[PDB]
């Protein structure tokens, strides 16, 4: 656990910090794609009216 | 960096992912093709008189 | 630690899959979207 920050050292391992970073990036990319998809779906047909 | 070395490192465990994906794709394709063929070559059900 | 990272990843992924399937089913069954016609 050398690459882990001091504050999160007792909770995370050196081999898990990178995987956590990958998960965070995947979540953000998915949120952006979901925003785009929702905008197009509203452009197709409104669902609230 | 991975959390499942037994699944993302060994060939035998690496084969199961592709096997499952292919199984799902084959099932979906077969169902869709059968129902498309059935609904395309069938006459109009109810002609009123 | 209270929760292993592997368990958290598995639980989150499965919950996301179930939510996506359920939301697609409910939205497609509604009267606004008639199963994409």
């Amino acid at each position: 656990n050398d690459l882990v920050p001091d504050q999160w050292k007792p909770l995370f391992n050196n081999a898990q910090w990178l995987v956590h970073d990958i998960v965070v990036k995947t979540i953000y990319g998915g949120l952006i794609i979901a925003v785009i998809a929702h905008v197009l779906c509203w452009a197709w047909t409104p669902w609230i009216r | 960096p991975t959390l499942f070395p037994e699944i993302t490192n060994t060939v035998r465990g690496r084969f199961y992912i592709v096997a499952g994906i292919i199984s799902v794709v084959m099932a979906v394709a077969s169902i869709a093709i059968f129902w498309w063929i059935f609904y395309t070559i069938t006459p109009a059900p109810a002609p009123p008189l | 630690r209270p929760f292993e990272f592997r368990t958290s990843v598995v639980v989150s992924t499965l919950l996301g899959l179930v939510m996506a399937l359920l939301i697609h089913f409910v939205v497609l069954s509604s009267g606004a979207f008639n199963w994409l016609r």
Binding site: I33, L40, C41 | - | -
Partner: peptide
């Protein structure tokens, strides 16, 4: 406009699947 959206989501799904498979399969 339904078929265009269907193609869009299908292409997105294919791209994501290929990217994650390449990440794992390396």
């Amino acid at each position: 406009m339904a078929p265009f959206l269907m193609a869009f989501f299908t292409i997105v799904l294919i791209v994501a699947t290929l990217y994650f498979l390449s990440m794992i399969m390396s």
